[PDB]
Symmetry: D2
Subunit: 277 residues, 4 copies
C-alpha cells in the first residue's frame, strides 16, 4: 500500500490539452457544457504558446491565434461528445491535412474514471486521471487490439437506410454460415465510448453512409481521423468503405465521412462485403 | 455558490444498503470485486439489525442471519452487474415472494457519478452520491417515464435465436409501416445502464426468451423484480411476455425470467406482437 | 443517509471570490502559489463585472480594472497566508477606506476541509467547501464568540521586544492573581488559523507593536480590517491598542497595524493594561 | 503532466495500519470519532493475521487477539490525537517493552493532505495519502532534522508550574545572552502537529514535568515512544529530561512520561539546563 510516482513544443501542447481535459472532467462530474468545454481547450491551447491554427467542432470557422502566442502545430478537436468524451488530433490551409500527417492524437472518456487514450506515433498508451494529483497515470503501454473480435457495433435502427454492404455484413454477424456463434451486439451511441470498447475488447464499430447521411455523420478532422489514428496505432484498421480514413483529403474543416474501424480482420471482412457490391 | 443541506426498521436497512453502495462505488473507481462487494452488502445488511433472510446473486443458498442481529425484512440483491451497478429488492420460504410484496427497491449505477434510483412505494427518486459528504443527494423527485419512447434496446446479435414475437417487434421498430421514423437502437449490455437510460430517456428494453436461454437470462429475485418495481413506480410496464414480472411466483431463488420493460405504450405494442403468435 | 440541497452586484462578486477560493484550495491540496493564487482572484474578480479597484497583498500598486468590466465595489485581499488561508474585504482613493465602510468580508482556511467565515453585516456564517459539488455548504449560522475565553495567542518569542502593556498582560494570563487557572497558550503562527481558533473556541489573539515592528506586522487593508470585521460581527473586539482596527484611517494601501482581537472581555482586559501605561 | 506509479508479516501489518489510517482520514474530512477510529485500527490490525497483543489509548486493558488470527508483533497506538493524527509503534508482558525494541513506528497527520511519517529502522520516509488511488505516495526519503533550529514549542501558559530547568531554558530562547535572535515560538497544541513541524522545520518541542502533571501528560507506549523513534531515526533526540524516551522501562501500559525532542543540539541545550539544577 505504498507507491512512488515517476514522470513519463509538442510536449507542452499535450500538457495543456491534458489540463483542459482535467478541467472538463470536473465540470462533467456535476449544452452549457459545450460552450464551457470549448473555451477551456481553445484558451489552454492558445496559451500553450505552441499553436497557430485551431479547428473546433463548436466553431464554424478556424481559430487563428495571436502572433505573440503563435506556434508550430495545428489542433482539430471535438471538446465534448452515458459516458461522453473529448477528441483531438495534432497536425486554414494548414488545417486541411490528410490524417497521415498527424503527429499526435487521442481521446478522453469521462466515466467513473477519466481515461485518456494517447499516441504520438509509436503506439497507444492509456492513462487514468488522478484527480487528487491533477496528473495522468499510465495504466497500459502500447495497447494492442485483437486481430479479430466477437462484437459488432452500430445503430441497427437505421437498417432501412443501410447500403447493401452494411446489410450483408450485419447478416453475416447474426447468421454466420460457417457455424460459428453470432457476434454480440453493443452500441452505447457515444462514439468515444463505442470506439474505446472496440479498442479494448475487440471487434468492429460502424457509422457508415446511409440514405439519410450519404457522407456519414461523424466528422473527419476531429472525430474520425483522431480515432482512426489511435486505432491504427493499436494494430487495427479504419476505413470509409473505400479508403483508409487517414488517407482522405479534407475539402472542408467540418467535412463528414463514413467510419468503419476495429480489429483488422473484422474491418477486412466488412471491406469484402463492399468490393462485392 | 452557497447551499444548505437538509435531511430527507425499513429506514435503517436502506441506510446500510446505501452505505454498502458508497463502499462499492469507491472500490470501483479503482472478479475480486464480486467477492468484495458481496461481503460489503451482507455484512452491512446483517449488522443493520433488521434482516432475517438474504439472497445474493453470489451465494447458492440464502443467508440466514444470527438471531441477535435478526430483523423483519428480506433482501434479494445483485451486488455487482462500462457502467456497472448494484440491484436490490427489500421484501428461505420468506425469500420466495412475488414481486408485488416489495416494500422497497432500487439500483445504483457507477458512472462519473454514482446514481441511485430508489422507491418505497410512492414513486421513484433519483439520488447522486456526494462522496465528500458520504451522503446521497436527491436530484429528482417522482421520476416519470415517457408514455412512449423512440428507443429500443436488446442484443440483436441473438436474432437467430429470437422467438417470432421479438422478431416481429424489432421489424416494426426498423420498418414502421405507419411512416413514422424508425426507433433508434441503444444497447450498452449492462442491465442497470440500459434500464436507467430507458427510465430517463424512454423507450423499451428487452432480454426475452430465445433458443439459447428459453427462460431468459436475467434473474427474477434481484435483477428483474427490482427494476420491474422501479419501472412500474415510474409509470411504466415490466413483463415476461406473458405476465407482469412482479406477478411471477418464484419457484427458486436463482430463477431466471424474460424481461421486457419501459414506456408503457412500447411494452404494450410488444405484448400485441406476442398475443398474435 | 439522504439529503436535499437548497440555495442560500455584491452577490455575483462574492460568488467569484468563492470560486477563486475553490480554485486556490485545490492548488494547495498539492512561492509559485502566491503568484498563482493572486492571479486567480484578480481575474475572477475582474471578470465578475463588478469591481473598479483592487488591492492585493502581492501587488505594490492598486489594480484598476478595464471600464468594460468595471463595477461598484473595491476589494482588498491577501490571496495566501500548517493551515494557510485567503483574506478579503469588500468596500486608489476609493481603496483607502476605514474598516467601518466594509460591505462584506471573510476568510478561507485550507485544512482537511476548506472553511469560509463570511459576513455581509448581519452576522457571521461558516461554510465548508464541498469539492464534489464545487459549492459552499453552510455549517453554522450567526457564529458568536464567547464573552470570555481561556486561551491567549501570540509569539512569546518576541518577549524581549514587547511593550509594557503586552508584558503585563501575558503576566496576568500566566499568574492570575485572582486564583483562577492560567490561560492555555496556542500559537499556530498562521493568522487565519489563529484567528479562526479564537472565533470558535474563544480567547484572544495578539500581534501588537514591538521594538522590531513598532507599527505591527499585519496589514490593515486585507488582513486586519477583514478579520476585525468578522470578529466584531461575531460579538468580539478588534483593537490596535489605542483604537478599534475598523476605525483606523488608512494612509497607505500596504499600511501595517497592531492587531489585538477576540472575546470582548479578554480584549477589554488587554486595553486596561494599555491605559495603565 | 504524465506519471507512472511503482510499488515501494511486518509488511502486511503496516499495510493494514495504513488502511485503517485511510479509513480514519475520510471520517475526519466530515468523540464519536474516538470510538470509530479505535475500532478501525483494532479490527484491521486483528484481521491482518499478524498481531498477538494490542494496546490502545482508548482501552484500559490490552487487547489479546484470537489464536486463529494471532501473529508475532505487538502494536501500541493512539487512534486519534486543527490538525489531529494517529500514532503507533510496532514491537501483556509482551507489550511493556522499552522503546529500543521498536521494529516499526509512525504517525499520520490529517490536514489538507493526509501525511504519514514512517520508519522501520533505516530512516524516516514521508508519505502523502492519495485518496483516489487509496494508496500512500512517497514524497520524501530519509528525512533529516536540522542539527539546530530556531523554534521552541510548549504551552507557556503552564509557566507557573514549570520546573527550574524549563524556566531557565525558555528564558534563554527569549533572551539569548549570546546576542543571537530569540527563537520563534509555535504551539499548535496537537502533539502530532507540533512534532511534525519540529521534524520538518527544526527546533524543539516540550511537554515536560510540571507541578500539575509531575510525570508529564503524554503517554509512553503510543505517543512518546513512537514519535521518539521517528525523531531519532531522523537524526534528533528525544528525552524525558533524565533519559532518552526510548530507554524508559514501562511499568504500565498507560504510563505517562515527560517529552522533550527535536534538533539534537536544541535538546542538548535543554539537557544542560537540567544537569545544572
Ligand atoms: O445516430 P446515432 O446512432 O444516434 O449516433 C450518435 C453519434 O453522434 C455522436 O453522439 C456525436 O455526434 P456528432 O458527430 O454530431 O458530434 C457520436 O458520439 C455518436 O457515434
Ligand atoms: O447476453 P448479453 O446481451 O451480453 O446481456 C448481458 C446481461 O447480463 C448482465 O451483464 C448480467 O448478467 P447476469 O444475469 O448473469 O447477472 C446484464 O447486465 C446484461 O443485461
Ligand atoms: O512573526 P510571527 O509570529 O511568525 O507571525 C507570522 C504572521 O505572519 C503571517 O504569516 C502573514 O505574514 P504577512 O503579514 O507578511 O502577510 C500571519 O499568518 C502570521 O500571523
Ligand atoms: O496541555 P496542552 O498544552 O493543551 O497539551 C495538549 C496535548 O494533549 C494532546 O492533545 C493529547 O492528549 P493525550 O495525551 O491525553 O492523548 C496532545 O496532542 C497535545 O500535545
Amino acid at each position: 500500500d505504498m507507491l512512488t510516482l515517476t514522470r513519463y513544443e509538442l510536449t507542452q501542447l499535450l500538457n495543456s490539452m491534458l489540463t483542459a481535459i482535467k478541467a472538463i472532467s470536473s465540470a462533467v462530474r456535476k449544452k452549457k457544457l459545450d460552450v464551457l468545454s470549448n473555451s477551456l481547450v481553445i484558451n489552454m491551447l492558445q496559451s500553450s504558446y505552441s499553436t497557430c491554427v485551431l479547428v473546433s467542432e463548436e466553431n464554424k470557422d478556424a481559430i487563428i491565434t495571436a502572433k505573440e502566442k503563435r506556434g508550430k502545430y495545428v489542433v482539430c478537436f471535438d471538446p465534448l461528445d452515458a459516458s461522453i468524451g473529448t477528441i483531438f488530433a495534432i497536425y486554414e490551409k494548414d488545417a486541411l491535412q490528410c490524417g497521415r500527417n498527424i503527429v499526435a492524437a487521442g481521446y478522453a472518456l469521462y466515466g467513473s474514471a477519466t481515461l485518456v487514450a494517447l499516441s504520438t506515433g509509436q503506439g497507444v498508451d492509456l492513462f487514468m486521471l488522478d484527480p487528487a494529483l491533477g496528473e495522468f497515470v499510465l495504466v497500459e503501454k502500447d495497447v494492442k487490439i485483437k486481430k479479430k473480435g466477437k462484437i459488432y457495433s452500430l445503430n441497427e435502427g437505421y437498417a432501412k437506410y443501410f447500403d447493401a454492404a452494411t446489410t450483408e455484413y450485419v447478416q453475416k454477424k447474426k447468421f454466420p454460415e460457417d457455424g460459428s456463434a453470432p457476434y454480440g451486439a453493443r452500441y452505447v451511441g457515444s462514439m468515444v465510448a463505442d470506439v474505446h470498447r472496440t479498442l479494448v475488447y475487440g471487434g468492429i464499430f460502424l457509422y457508415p453512409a446511409n440514405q439519410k447521411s450519404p457522407k456519414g455523420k461523424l466528422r473527419l478532422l476531429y472525430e474520425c481521423n483522431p480515432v482512426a489514428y489511435i486505432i491504427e496505432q493499436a494494430g487495427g484498421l479504419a476505413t470509409t468503405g473505400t479508403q483508409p480514413v487517414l488517407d482522405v483529403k479534407p475539402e472542408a474543416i467540418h467535412q463528414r465521412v463514413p467510419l468503419i474501424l476495429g480489429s483488422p480482420e473484422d474491418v477486412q471482412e466488412y471491406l469484402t462485403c463492399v468490393q462485392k457490391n
